[PDB]
């Protein structure tokens, strides 16, 4: 049986959590994340994957630094009190 | 009777997962984990077992005293007694033959 009896045999994760994105997409044997391309320098992205680009892009996170850049520009990148 | 279980998390009958059954003062049978048996050190030339040298694991050899790891003879803990005897005899005899060969070569050249 290629169905249920063979499904009984799947207990070895081919993917684990990825350091760069916590997506369970890090292929263990290939040592590459199938989602972000880790450990390559460039995050994996394709122009046929517009939904994927939406999921992984600027503004989908906290923007811990980039959120204040517009305010600082609007103020002229001032310094002082 | 009383059935035992493995004491470590290794569930397999591996060479490093060997157990004996022992009876404890609590009256119950327990699995004791038995380490690998040590192999006798071998002679460097014969490859035969060296007597007067203890059987220990290599790291166990570091804790013991020097007299357990060698013999009072030259080449003691490294070569067999018969090996050392054969090498002494061979060394002396071949060097004597070297002297004789040197003398005979010199004397035949002087005659020539």
């Amino acid at each position: 049986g290629k169905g249920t009896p063979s499904f009984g045999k799947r207990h070895n994760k081919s993917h684990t959590l990825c350091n760069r994105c916590g997506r369970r997409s890090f292929h263990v044997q290939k040592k590459t994340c199938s989602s972000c391309g880790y450990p390559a320098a460039k995050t994996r992205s394709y122009n046929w994957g517009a939904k994927a680009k939406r999921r992984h892009t600027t503004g989908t996170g906290r923007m811990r630094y980039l959120k204040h850049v517009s305010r600082r520009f609007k103020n002229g990148f001032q310094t002082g009190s | 009777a009383q059935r035992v279980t493995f004491r470590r998390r290794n569930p397999y009958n591996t060479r490093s997962n060997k157990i004996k059954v022992v009876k404890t003062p609590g009256g119950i049978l327990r699995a004791q984990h038995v380490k690998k048996l040590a192999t006798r050190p071998k002679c460097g030339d014969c490859g035969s077992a060296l007597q007067g040298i203890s059987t220990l694991r290599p790291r166990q050899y570091a804790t013991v005293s020097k007299t357990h790891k060698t013999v009072s003879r030259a080449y003691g803990g490294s070569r067999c007694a018969n090996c050392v005897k054969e090498r002494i005899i061979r060394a002396f005899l071949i060097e004597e033959q070297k002297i004789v060969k040197k003398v005979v070569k010199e004397q035949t050249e002087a005659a020539k």
Partner: protein, 50 residues
């Protein structure tokens, strides 16, 4: 498994503390439409699959 790694154990802890019903006072807060924890998880129902 019993012999976990710290990353997996940390994910376990995060999921365990997340898995709790909604506090009773957030319901009473004004302009509040949240009535229950929608992101609730049971270990049999839905696997985290990490």
């Amino acid at each position: 498994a019993a012999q976990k790694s710290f990353r997996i154990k940390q994910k376990m802890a995060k999921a365990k503390k997340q898995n709790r019903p909604l506090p009773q006072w957030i319901r009473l807060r004004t302009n509040n439409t949240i009535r229950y924890n929608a992101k609730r998880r049971n270990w049999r129902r839905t696997k985290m699959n990490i």
